[PDB]
RNA sequence: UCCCCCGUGCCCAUAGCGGCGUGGAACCACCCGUUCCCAUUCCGAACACGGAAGUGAAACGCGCCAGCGCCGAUGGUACUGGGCGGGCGACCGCCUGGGAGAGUAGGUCGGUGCGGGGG
RNA sequence: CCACCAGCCUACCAAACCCUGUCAAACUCCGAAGGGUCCCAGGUGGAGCCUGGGAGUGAGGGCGCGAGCGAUAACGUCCGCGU
RNA sequence: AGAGCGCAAGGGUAGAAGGGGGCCUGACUGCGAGGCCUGCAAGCCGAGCAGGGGCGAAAGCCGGGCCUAGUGAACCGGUGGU
């Protein structure tokens, strides 16, 4: 169920993804959690859309 | 008491019982010799037995030694003996079951009541030199419900005990009737 | 009882209503009571 | 009557009735008692048939030790109805008893009395019976 | 035919029995990958050259010879020793 | 009561089963399987100095040279209620390299 | 080694009274103090929770040692609160601290128990411990009026090294306790 | 080569629960101090750090008792691949190889590699 | 039957407790028979392997014993190895 | 070890998978040995490797959570992007 809406953590550097899920019912805002894209290393990873 | 017991070998105990010479095993400390009694007189003299007596086995080997019973095998179906174990005796204090000669007709008794013979056999240790036949337990002033137990009985100087001491040896209870049609509900 | 904001210690009296001069070491600097 | 009021599995199957008493065919209780002869279920309603004519015939009598407890559901199903549609309901609460199993005894009564009383009492019980004392029934608790 | 009152149920559903048990026994050779036990709880516990992923399941790391281990005061183990 | 088999975490590979008991530090190296041991370095039973943290230091690297004489390389520091208090002997510069 | 009036008291007092009416001929068997713990077991911080805790922290000030908020464990359906995290303060106190504690205690706390007829010689745990309860929190010398709200007692938890009756009550009587008789 | 104690693995309660007895000169546990590493969801409890006095009490190492715990023969039944039959049935018997539980007897308060500290 | 708090109890109701008997598929302290699988060896047999084309065949039914449903009724009817 | 282990049980579990805390953020990238399962199609456990990163002195751990459900082939499209 939503209020926990899902998102695809898009990274900077012009794309590269890892897929997750939020939590609106929790104080969780946007999320720039440290993950590793298809190209490079454990750099950044932010949050976009659904 | 007396009972001719013949040695056993390696035959099938099936034949034994169904021929008369009834299969039974005896042991003691290290031994576990193989013999058999007979159908008729073993069963007869066993009514006079139980682990209250000293049974002699007169083995046709020139030996004749006493034992006490232990672990009897009934045939379940058509219930009647099909094996007996015999623990041999010594003379250093060992353990068996004492019978309780109930002596006394109290007040719950007589004025109704039903006898409650609980541990008709109690676990006790005696020196096999003095093998006391029985011990008389007395009801005397016992009303329906109440009970007799522990150190209320007789203990011959050579007789020492070990059961609870608590455990009820005997008691009395209400005798039922047709006013249970009223209870029926 | 190290930690941080521990409520302190320090000496104190017991100037009772009888004539007691008991020496103590309690959280309050100056106390006095009955007996 | 008497039985459990709420056990585990209400609808419980029948199974199989082979033999051996499972244990409990000695005496250990009353003066004179009754032993089964046919390996099967045995009714509670019949247990109380027994106890009825028994304790009835001998009013002001002794005491009864019934070592039998009838708690196995009957799988009984409606009349004038088709097959399937469900499984039988927990009717007739009976017990698993084979021959030998010293069903039930009494004490505080005289020989001839226990003889006749248990004779009719057991007579009622849905089979054939045997009547036992307390002699060669020694030691096997 | 006057079929008096009937009934219905809910007890018609049954979970699908997925294949369970140990796959190898003392002797066989695993080759890194050859899983050996589809178990629930630690009915058998890993040790030498034996792994255990996410489902409680012991498997292969080396080209090993299977063996068991009785330990009681810890349970039962499954060990593997290849060549050495 | 720090059993846990913290020594199951020391089932891992190779062992250095120590145990300080008030006065002497009973530090030891054990090879496994065979249950055959190796080293029994100590403080006061070693007939060296007499303090906890000092001997430790030195004895730690004593062990260094020891193992580097017997062609080993690494093992594993072991105790129930260890907590690790450096003692930068910490038997790793002491041979093991594991520090 | 902070010296208090009860320290030097219990000091000499315990030893030869025990050496004379008793005597465990082995210098280290005579049992003495141990742990002085206190716990009030409310459950009335159903809500208003930790505002009812500040009432209990000024208590931590009177002894001089911070407390730990211990809690419930199950699912209560009467006085509310399930899971288990209410107002069950368990405060732990030791050697020199229990000394100033039971100093103000045995010297000036027990006299204003207006119901005073003596400590209970029956609330012993027979293992060298002595639990009981009380009614007012202001019976402890350093908490004036302008601070107390409703009602607040506590359940005194004093454990000793002792483990037999007569000597438990004896240690306490050698410490200066106001018991029954 | 051996006895004792302290670190340890291993068989996996015949290993332990209780009771009684015993040493600490060594190792050991306390103990004392919290100046100091550490740290208390609060507590010198603790995990530690600084070691005189003193202790063998709690811990422990060892024994003596079966009282509980556990192990438990085997004489022997229950049953069971295989095969053969009796009755309407439910079930039952025969020959063969196998063959427990129960508890009867009895047993055991255990033993073994490595390492070190002492004679 | 008193309060410094308690003393006290019944041929009264009444849990825990144990002894005596105890039943269970979804209860398991023990657990067979057998069955299943891998190694060695024998086993020469309308065996087994691989590939390819050519097939069909998928309401099965009396019997035995292992369980169910029925009602410990059915030429009932649903699985099981076996026939 | 009958407690607790999100929600059904079963099973397993304290020599943790439970309960508290410090630093993070491996519900990673490229793969994939080999097995379980099974007509297919999916489902499934995953040594070990190369980049890089967290923790821990280190040994070593991290490709989600004790586990057995929390699912939808393919086209037809929608957004960001090569």
UniProtKB/Swiss-Prot annotation, chain C:
Zn(2+) binds at residues 16, 18. Part of the 50S ribosomal subunit. The chain holds residues 1 to 35 of 71 of the full protein. Belongs to the bacterial ribosomal protein bL31 family. Type A subfamily. It comes from Thermus thermophilus (strain ATCC BAA-163 / DSM 7039 / HB27). It comes from the Bacteria. This is Large ribosomal subunit protein bL31. Binds the 23S rRNA.
Curated annotation (Swiss-Prot), chain D:
It comes from the Bacteria. GO terms for cellular component: cytosolic large ribosomal subunit. The keyword Heme does not apply. Binds 23S rRNA and is also seen to make contacts with the A and possibly P site tRNAs. The keyword Ribosomal protein applies. Keywords: Ribonucleoprotein, Ribosomal protein, RNA-binding, rRNA-binding, tRNA-binding. The lineage of its organism: Bacteria, Thermotogati, Deinococcota, Deinococci, Thermales. This is Large ribosomal subunit protein uL16.
Swiss-Prot record, chain F:
Keywords: Ribonucleoprotein, Ribosomal protein, RNA-binding, rRNA-binding. InterPro entries: Ribosomal_uL18_bac-type, Ribosomal_uL18_bac/euk. One of its GO terms (cellular component) is cytosolic large ribosomal subunit. It comes from the Bacteria. Disulfide bonds: none annotated. One of its GO terms (biological process) is translation. SUPFAM superfamilies: Translational machinery components (SSF53137). Belongs to the universal ribosomal protein uL18 family. HAMAP family: Ribosomal_uL18_B. This is one of the proteins that bind and probably mediate the attachment of the 5S RNA into the large ribosomal subunit, where it forms part of the central protuberance. Part of the 50S ribosomal subunit; part of the 5S rRNA/L5/L18/L25 subcomplex. Contacts the 5S and 23S rRNAs. This is Large ribosomal subunit protein uL18.
Swiss-Prot record, chain G:
Keywords: Ribonucleoprotein, Ribosomal protein, RNA-binding, rRNA-binding, tRNA-binding. The keyword Ribonucleoprotein applies. PROSITE patterns: RIBOSOMAL_L5. Signal peptide: none annotated. InterPro entries: Ribosomal_uL5, Ribosomal_uL5_bac-type, Ribosomal_uL5_C, Ribosomal_uL5_CS, Ribosomal_uL5_dom_sf, Ribosomal_uL5_N. Disulfide bonds: none annotated. It comes from the Bacteria. The keyword Ribosomal protein applies. One of its GO terms (molecular function) is structural constituent of ribosome. One of its GO terms (biological process) is translation. One of its GO terms (cellular component) is ribonucleoprotein complex. Belongs to the universal ribosomal protein uL5 family. HAMAP family: Ribosomal_uL5_B. This is one of the proteins that bind and probably mediate the attachment of the 5S RNA into the large ribosomal subunit, where it forms part of the central protuberance. In the 70S ribosome it contacts protein S13 of the 30S subunit (bridge B1b), connecting the 2 subunits; this bridge is implicated in subunit movement. Contacts the P site tRNA; the 5S rRNA and some of its associated proteins might help stabilize positioning of ribosome-bound tRNAs. NCBIfam families: PRK00010.1. Part of the 50S ribosomal subunit; part of the 5S rRNA/L5/L18/L25 subcomplex. Contacts the 5S rRNA and the P site tRNA. Forms a bridge to the 30S subunit in the 70S ribosome. This is Large ribosomal subunit protein uL5. It comes from Thermus thermophilus (strain ATCC BAA-163 / DSM 7039 / HB27). The gene is rplE.
């Amino acid at each position: 169920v939503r209020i926990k809406l899902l998102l695809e953590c898009t990274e900077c550097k012009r794309r590269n993804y890892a897929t997750e899920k939020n939590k609106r019912n929790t104080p969780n805002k946007l999320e720039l959690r440290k993950y590793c894209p298809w190209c490079r290393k454990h750099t950044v990873h932010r949050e976009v859309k659904i | 008491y007396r009972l001719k017991a013949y040695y056993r070998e390696g035959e099938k105990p099936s034949a034994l019982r169904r021929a008369g010479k009834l299969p039974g095993v005896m042991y003691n400390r290290h031994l576990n010799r193989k013999v058999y009694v007979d159908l008729v007189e073993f069963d007869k003299v066993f009514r006079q037995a139980s682990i209250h007596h000293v049974i002699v086995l007169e083995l046709p080997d020139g030996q004749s030694l006493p034992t006490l019973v232990r672990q009897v095998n009934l045939d379940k179906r058509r219930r009647r003996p099909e094996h007996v174990d015999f623990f041999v005796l010594s003379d250093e204090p060992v353990e068996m079951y004492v019978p309780l000669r109930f002596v006394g007709t109290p007040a719950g008794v007589r004025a109704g009541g039903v006898l409650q013979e609980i541990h008709r056999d109690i676990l006790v240790k005696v020196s096999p030199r003095n093998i006391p036949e029985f011990i008389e337990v007395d009801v005397s002033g016992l009303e329906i419900g109440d009970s007799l137990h522990a150190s209320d009985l007789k203990l011959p100087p050579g007789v020492e005990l070990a059961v609870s001491p608590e455990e009820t040896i005997a008691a009395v209870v209400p005798p039922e009737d047709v006013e249970k049609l009223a209870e029926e509900a | 009882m190290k930690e941080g904001i521990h409520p302190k210690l320090v000496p104190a009296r017991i100037i009772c209503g009888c004539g007691n001069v008991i020496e103590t070491y309690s959280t309050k600097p100056e106390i006095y009571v009955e007996v | 009557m008497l039985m459990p009021r709420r056990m585990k599995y209400r609808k419980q199957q029948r199974g199989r009735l082979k033999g051996a008493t499972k244990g409990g065919d000695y005496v250990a209780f009353g003066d004179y008692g009754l032993v089964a002869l046919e390996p099967a279920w045995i009714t509670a309603q019949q247990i109380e048939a027994a106890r009825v004519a028994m304790v009835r015939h001998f009013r002001r009598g002794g005491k009864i030790f019934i070592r039998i407890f009838p708690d196995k559901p009957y799988t009984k199903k409606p009349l004038e109805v088709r097959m399937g549609k469900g499984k039988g309901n927990v009717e007739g609460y009976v017990a698993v008893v084979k021959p030998g199993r010293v069903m039930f005894e009494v004490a505080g009564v005289t020989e001839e009395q226990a003889m006749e009383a248990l004779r009719i009492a057991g007579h009622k019980l849905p089979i054939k019976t045997k009547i036992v004392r307390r002699d060669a029934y020694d030691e096997a608790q | 035919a006057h079929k008096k009152g009937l009934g219905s149920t809910r007890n018609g559903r049954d979970s699908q029995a997925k294949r369970l048990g140990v796959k190898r026994y003392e002797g066989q050779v695993v080759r890194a990958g050859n899983i050996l036990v589809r178990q629930r709880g630690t009915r058998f516990k890993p040790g030498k050259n034996v792994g255990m992923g996410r489902d409680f399941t012991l498997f292969a790391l080396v080209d090993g010879v299977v063996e068991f281990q009785d330990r009681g005061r810890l349970g039962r183990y499954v060990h593997v020793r290849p060549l050495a | 009561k720090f059993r846990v088999r913290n020594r199951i975490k020391r089932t891992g590979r190779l062992r250095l089963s120590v145990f300080r008991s008030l006065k002497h530090i009973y530090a030891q190296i054990i090879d496994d399987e065979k249950g055959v041991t190796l080293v029994s370095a100590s403080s006061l039973a070693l007939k060296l100095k007499g303090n906890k943290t000092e001997v430790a230091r030195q004895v730690g690297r004593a062990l260094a040279e020891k193992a580097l004489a017997l062609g080993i390389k690494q093992v594993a520091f072991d105790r129930g209620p260890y907590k690790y208090h450096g003692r930068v002997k910490a038997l790793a510069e002491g041979a093991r390299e594991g520090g | 080694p902070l010296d208090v009036a009860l320290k030097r008291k219990y000091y000499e007092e315990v030893r030869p009274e025990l050496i004379r009416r008793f005597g465990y001929q082995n210098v280290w068997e005579v049992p003495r103090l141990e742990k002085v713990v206190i716990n009030q077991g409310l459950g009335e911080a159903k809500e208003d929770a930790r505002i009812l805790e500040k009432a209990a922290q000024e208590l931590a000030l009177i002894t001089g040692q911070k407390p730990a908020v211990t809690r419930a464990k199950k699912s209560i359906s009467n006085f509310k609160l399930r899971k288990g995290m209410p107002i069950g303060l368990r405060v732990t106190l030791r050697r020199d601290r229990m000394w100033i504690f039971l100093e103000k205690l045995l010297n000036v706390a027990l006299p204003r128990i207006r119901d005073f007829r003596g400590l209970n010689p029956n609330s012993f745990d027979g293992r060298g411990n002595y639990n009981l309860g009380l009614r007012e929190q202001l019976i402890f010398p350093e908490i004036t009026y302008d601070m107390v709200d409703a009602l607040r007692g506590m359940d005194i938890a004093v454990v000793t090294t002792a483990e037999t009756d007569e000597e438990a009550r004896a240690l306490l009587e050698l410490l200066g306790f106001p018991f029954r008789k």
